């Protein structure tokens, strides 16, 4: 239920919740083709889940 | 007498404008409560605005509150 966003002016300053993002790779998709692919995370995503 | 009788008459000719005279003596009675209803509408607009048209009804006065979050970035 946690966002990165939910971090930011609460107990973290905006610059550095992107770098702690970035350091995670998030599945995002379909693309044109209609396949899946990966790019690092933003402050909209939610916490990885093992 | 015919003279008596047109005055008493006449005593009532008038009857359109002693109404208009009517609506004046109840409208000053009635409009200065479009200012309590008037404070109350501002005061519900008011948050709806954006800062800058905030700080200048008020002559500078009012501010951002200040709760202790959300500041300046190093
Ligand atoms: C002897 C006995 C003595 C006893 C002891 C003493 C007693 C007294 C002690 C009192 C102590 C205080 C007590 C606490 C009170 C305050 C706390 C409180 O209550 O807060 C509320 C509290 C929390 O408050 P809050 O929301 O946090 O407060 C935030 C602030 O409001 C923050 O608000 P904001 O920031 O959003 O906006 C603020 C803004 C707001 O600003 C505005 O909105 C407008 C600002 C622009 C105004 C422009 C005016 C232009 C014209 C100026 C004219 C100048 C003329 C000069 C003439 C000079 C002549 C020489 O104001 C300002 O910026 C400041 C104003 C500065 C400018 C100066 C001008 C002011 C206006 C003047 C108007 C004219 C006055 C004179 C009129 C007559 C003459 C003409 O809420 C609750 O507790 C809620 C509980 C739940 C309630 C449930 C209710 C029922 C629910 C069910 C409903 C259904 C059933 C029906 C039930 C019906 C029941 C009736």
Redesign the interface.
């Given at each position: 239920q946690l966002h990165f966003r939910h971090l930011v002016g609460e107990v973290l300053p905006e610059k550095r919740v992107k770098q702690i993002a970035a350091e995670y790779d998030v599945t995002d998709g379909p693309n044109d083709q209609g396949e899946m692919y990966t790019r690092p995370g933003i402050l909209g995503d939610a916490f990885p889940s093992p | 007498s015919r003279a008596v009788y047109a005055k008493l008459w006449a005593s009532t000719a008038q009857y359109t404008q002693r109404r208009h005279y009517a609506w004046y003596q109840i409208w000053s009675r009635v409009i200065p409560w479009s200012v309590p209803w008037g404070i109350f509408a501002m005061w519900m607009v008011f948050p709806a605005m954006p800062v800058e048209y905030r700080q200048a009804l008020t002559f500078g006065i009012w501010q951002k509150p200040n709760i202790g979050?959300?500041?300046p970035?190093?």
């Open positions: - | 979050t959300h500041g970035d190093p």
